[PDB]
Ligand binder design. Structure first.
Ligand SMILES: Nc1nc2c(ncn2[C@@H]2O[C@@H]3COP(=O)(O)O[C@H]3[C@H]2O)c(=O)[nH]1
Ligand SMILES: Nc1nc2c(ncn2[C@@H]2O[C@@H]3COP(=O)(O)O[C@H]3[C@H]2O)c(=O)[nH]1
Ligand SMILES: Nc1nc2c(ncn2[C@@H]2O[C@@H]3COP(=O)(O)O[C@H]3[C@H]2O)c(=O)[nH]1
Ligand SMILES: Nc1nc2c(ncn2[C@@H]2O[C@@H]3COP(=O)(O)O[C@H]3[C@H]2O)c(=O)[nH]1
Ligand SMILES: [Ca+2]
Lengths: 450, 450, 450, 450
């Protein structure tokens, strides 16, 4: 065997089947409308159509060999897959899109390729590929815009073909509106035919309407309907363009809107230009160093038993340098990684101060912190990455003259990325295995006596 | 009896009255402006107008026979309904729209059907039908787009009629702007008249303006006003189109935006392509198997005493296979169905692990789980649908060497849809009837000894 | 005083000063550009300009006599108000807009009314009136759309005047782009002048561009700049139109989106058409009876000491029929009115059932409820409006064989609007005055014995 | 060293390098396409190009001398900065944009300035400056709109240059579509050349299309592609304009939407016009006095150890007049400034009333309050700014006949801005230093006895 739709093989086949479906959606109508296209390159159209039909057949086979999830397990029983396929509307659409209507080439002649129009009924495969690509691609907005542009181009191409067909029905050159006479040297070339039809279609669907006005009632009606199709469908698509660009700007726009609200508040309250500059510097840091997004709000949509792995694969850089995690229990790190709230501190920010509520443990992910003196400048100890502080005031200790108080003040030399671990959480998670707690308050007593 | 507006009969009548109202809103102005329309098909217009008026009268009768809610009860007293009708502005509008202005046909002649313009004053019924359909239809966006297209078409039709009337007032063919001379063979046909007027209206309201420019001051003024009506009203309607398409994409766009934020985080943090593939697979599963929507956020707008029924009608498939619910008390299932949080687990995800906080009971809705050994591969027990686990570590038990600990580790073979029932909730809800609890810890002791 | 800007007198004056400001913003540029406008109606323009200037002077006086809030109190000291006025930029703008530039009529002649262009510098007053109207009017969206249309019209009018002025500078009729020769009988009329200039402006600002193309470099540059002004500013304004219509649809669109999510869930889960019809009926009820909006989310932006008054003025209809409120303490009703959560129940919905957690007291605002038998049909007692139930299981009672249990089952005959009062809240709020509690458990014992 | 990108020097250099990048992005294509531009002002183009290249070199030097943050510290080691520069793609782009392609002037002649097209590869610097300006400027929306207008102008300019180049390739005047013959006196001027090309570009990119239609297939194709570029890219940019105006209106629109929901509720519930006027007055006050924004929601994105400084720099005006803060401990004010919830009370609003739950302490930021008698009018004490009340009922006091009760009723004479400090918070924060608490209940006893 089976293909496992989640796999890469299924996605690759989705591409390989979208190619014929897109080809069919673009060219069947073109060949049906522009007769010279069908006739001049008939030897190539036959090859391409037969290849497309072969790929359609192989796609039907793949649909027979693609497993589905019952009880969460991939069904691998062949006949069960055949039944699941045939019971779905997709099998009906596939049989309809693979009906050998090409036999009508013997009745209607080689000049009627619209018999292959049923081949469009595999559009679903194409759309599936798109909805898969949009999910799996690393450039979701680039692909989304390319998809919208493809839709625009297909719509304009189809409307060009429709215009040319209507000109044919009315008669080429019978009036100033229809496509001019084919017998003209310049206006008889297939290139000119298609490109002028596309020009007309673009002027109509984009509602520019710089083309010769209608003469007959059918022409007036078609032009009204087509200008309305233009207005509505092009507003739809080119406003989807707008929404895609909006969601492209979503993060940056939200960040900038927050900054603007802050600046409005500061200018209204006449906040000192010192503090205004400090705030602007904080936000410039958040942007430049790519910290505007908070991983919590993003990863909250992941499963906890997958977001856990995510956090591990991101923070194993530092949670191996820490003494508590991955050293004593070697598994405890998972119990708290999904609750280590990542904080960022500016240079000179006092994370801790003597005589404060010690309700948070900190793990230094990045940055240089200092166990300073209360004078403000004298740096007693420099804590680099992997260090952990703020854990002594969490625990119950014998001989602690300072209970629930910070034993020292910790300031940040530079921008520090820390993991604030709350006291309640450390309490709750160390209950399972105190084999790490013993050396934890080993460190605790050792630092509390000195 | 009375009609009970909530019923299907009332909605069917809403359709049957919207038909004449829509007919009146489309055709009265057309016949008033295009005199040949009124004259040539007068025998049909008379029949249709009289049928419309009869339906208007029957709609007034229905309004007299439609109950309203006082004290939440449907008023069935006839005279009370007559008073409620006559006291409402709707009765005034109905009498105004049913005034026999057709008598003016004897004074103004058969060429003045705008006397029936008062018939437009039942627009409310039409709109009511729409606002009912949008609520009750299964295709809300299809109907909404059809409604907007109907508004566009009606506006363009009315503007076409207005253009033709203005041409008539100025005189057909008196200058290049107005509709050409009626005496022309081609430009005198009612078909050509209406269709060219519609063409002009479309070019003007869609602000394409490819029509002959104004010559007189009245023409310049009307064209300015009409181009502005075009800009404003068509932006309104065709931006409502945009918002409707947006809300069509709302679920998919939110899902894809979450996936994009996740992928941005993973690529920025250089998350391993293993875990990136796992996350993409999780999201592909959520989409393909239609799990992107969380029933909680959707059904939270339902009444609890209706959302309860909803959850029952959805989850009675599994809550009959469970041993606790619908078996001992047979009513307890409602006390917890509105708090069974549905979770989804990937293949191989450890739902439970030995030596963890047993604070959640799980009911396997769909999927195969395994009571494995801690080695990781040896599957002791396979739990299929209807099974419940994680309930032993909830309860107070005699002789439990493992208190508040998982007696075994449960992993998911495939994608498991479970119902996580919190410990606090099971505690709170079993307090009412311990007739099920006794066999609950029957199972508990039986599994805790073996 | 003083005038007290919050008062109605200040708003009326805002209108009376917006009239000259709007007049000045519309007509000064018109008279400056269309010389015939200035000249032909000079006797009227002089009167209107002098009246506008008098009103400007009276507006300056009002600004001297309008109090401001210092320490939250309206300043009534005259000289303090004069200082507050003169210290503001508004005084500078007012003196600039009232500078007697009309004296230049003696130097530049009566054909130069753009000397009155400084009169536009009172635009602020106009805008203030708008921002006041939008706040105080009952039709905020009608006024907002009218304001946007006024901006569109003013912009188009100004661009028409600019086009005519540029034609004058280049010379009327010197090329096909500029306004045609004034000496023409038809193209020399002030009506034709202004209306064709407005036509050109509309075709340009709405980016239709169906006007004679530029001939000179200045004309090309102006047309480029004006088409870009068109694109940008008209997108701005006519997209503000879109956002205004969106916020017009905001409530209805949110309601309908909730209904659509519900219907999607129900159709996906194959919810029985019984329950689907019940849900659709619930939502039809919510809409038809105007219950889609929840007063909590709306009134949460009001002050509690004003939202309290709001809730009182709305619910004194029923909280006078209740026995506890406004009867014993006569002031207790305010302590709980801001926490009476309004619920709606469908016909047949069991609000209470025997043997359930009695943690909510209910006050029947509207609707008929029944104290039924557990059989389901036998109605023991019918509770109409003003009745209160679910209070016995809240209180501590002697001789209650049923503790924390519902003494009877309450069902809703029809759609009941109730006030669910939580047990914790009744406990917390009755602590202040048990003078009502005594008769409360009077009723309690009386019903618990029978 | 180093430059410290957060500093003002780096931003100034960002401007000084954006000037050549913008110059290059505007003029290289212009000179490449309009040959007369390159030739006539070659002496000036050479100077400007060499100055631009010198500034590019100095920008490369700056990039070598700009520190980056490792461990949150600004790297000042020269060679480390050289490595960080050369290891980034920016160094590749800078070397590519500074390659001396001007040497090709000796081969291709002075008429080929597109060899300087590589100079566009420093676009990043320009964009960086923009993203810095948008952050640091006080007019974010003005700058954003200016940036979008710059993008529009650059796109139109580039498309004008492209049109002129295509006309050159096809041949000037070979058909009606291309730019006319250069040999024409009027259509040969560089001014006319560029300005008509810009006119064509504007008519095409804004999809007005009032220019001579295509004649050749290449012209038709280019016009189709360019009209589509117009539609898509101009919708993008001029809808970004819409979103920028939306976020300009965001605060005012949210405020007005809240007011509209309130007014809809009041008119639907038939709220008395007294209370409707009171609510409208409250909202008029909120707007006029600039209180629609709540500093909590804005400043919650700031760091707590920066939002603290913000609140201090804003509220030190009053927290120096208070007796508790900045007087006894002199540091306690920071422990509670981030939890002082700012409330606003209308004139006559009873903040406190005798016999109520004293769970909030109030600090009068602005406004006159009264310790009144319960009669309602007799004002015992007038509390101005700096005063604090509601603190007696917080504390545990000996001899308090009124426990957890308000000792008096406090009403607001005028609009009072207060700081509501919750009881729990005062309890929690005074635990650290009771040196202020002693005089706190000094005041407490002193007022409780009298
Ligand atoms: N007092 C003290 N604290 C230190 C030293 N080195 C690291 N620390 C950390 O500084 C922290 C300050 O807050 P805590 O008292 O909670 O915990 C303290 C220790 O974790 C040291 O040498 N002396
Ligand atoms: N230990 C054990 N647990 C089982 C077995 N079969 C099912 N389970 C479930 O596995 C669950 C693991 O978590 P709990 O200990 O809370 O509850 C356990 C039982 O509900 C079994 O055979 N042995
Ligand atoms: N048992 C009983 N309850 C009644 C009667 N009339 C009204 N009620 C209300 O029905 C309510 C059901 O819930 P509670 O027991 O909390 O409170 C009960 C009473 O408030 C009655 O006649 N008998
Ligand atoms: N009773 C009384 N209260 C006063 C007086 N002056 C100020 N107050 C304040 O009024 C407040 C009312 O609420 P509290 O009793 O909590 O605290 C009271 C005091 O803080 C006074 O003279 N008498
Ligand atoms: Ca257009």
């Amino acid at each position: 065997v089976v293909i496992d739709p989640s796999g890469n093989t299924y996605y690759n086949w989705l591409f390989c089947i979208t190619l014929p479906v897109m080809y069919n959606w673009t060219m069947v109508i073109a060949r049906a409308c522009f007769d010279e296209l069908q006739s001049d390159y008939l030897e190539y159209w036959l090859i391409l159509d037969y290849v497309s039909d072969i790929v359609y057949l192989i796609d039907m086979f793949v649909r027979t060999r693609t497993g589905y999830l019952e009880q969460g397990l991939l069904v691998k029983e062949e006949l069960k897959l055949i039944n699941k396929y045939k019971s779905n509307l997709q099998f009906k659409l596939d049989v309809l899109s693979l009906i050998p209507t090409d036999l009508l080439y013997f009745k209607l002649g080689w000049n009627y390729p619209e018999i292959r129009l049923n081949r469009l009924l595999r559009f679903s495969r194409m759309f599936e590929f798109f909805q898969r690509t949009e999910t799996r691609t690393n450039y979701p907005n680039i692909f989304r815009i390319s998809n919208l542009v493809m839709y625009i181009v297909i719509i304009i191409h189809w409307n060009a073909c429709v215009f040319y067909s209507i000109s044919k029905a009315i008669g080429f050159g019978n009036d100033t509106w229809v496509y001019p006479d084919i017998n003209d040297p310049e206006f008889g070339r297939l290139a000119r035919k298609y490109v002028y039809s596309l020009y007309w279609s673009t002027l109509t669907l984009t509602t520019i309407g710089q083309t010769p006005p209608p003469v007959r009632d059918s022409e007036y009606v078609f032009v009204v309907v087509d200008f309305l199709i233009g207005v509505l469908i092009f507003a739809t698509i080119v406003g989807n363009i707008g929404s895609m660009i909006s969601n492209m700007n979503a993060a940056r726009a939200e960040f900038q809107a927050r900054i603007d609200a802050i600046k409005q508040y500061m200018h209204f309250r006449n906040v000192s230009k010192d503090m205004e500059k400090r705030v602007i510097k904080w936000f410039d840091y958040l942007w430049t160093n790519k910290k505007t997004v908070d991983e919590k709000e993003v990863l909250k949509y992941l499963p906890d038993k997958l977001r856990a792995e995510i956090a591990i694969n991101v923070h194993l850089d530092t949670l191996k340098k820490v003494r508590i995690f991955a050293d004593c229990e070697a598994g405890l790190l998972v119990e708290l990684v999904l609750k280590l709230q990542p904080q960022v501190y500016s240079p000179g920010d006092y994370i801790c101060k003597k005589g404060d509520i010690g309700r948070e443990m900190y793990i230094i992910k990045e940055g240089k912190l200092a166990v300073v003196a209360d004078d403000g400048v004298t740096q007693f100890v420099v804590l680099s990455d992997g260090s952990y502080f703020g854990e002594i005031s969490i625990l119950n200790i014998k001989g602690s003259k300072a209970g629930n108080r910070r034993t020292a003040n910790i300031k940040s030399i530079g921008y520090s990325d820390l993991f604030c671990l709350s006291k309640d959480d450390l309490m709750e998670a160390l209950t399972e295995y105190p084999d790490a707690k013993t050396m934890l308050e080993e460190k605790g007593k050792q630092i509390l006596m000195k």
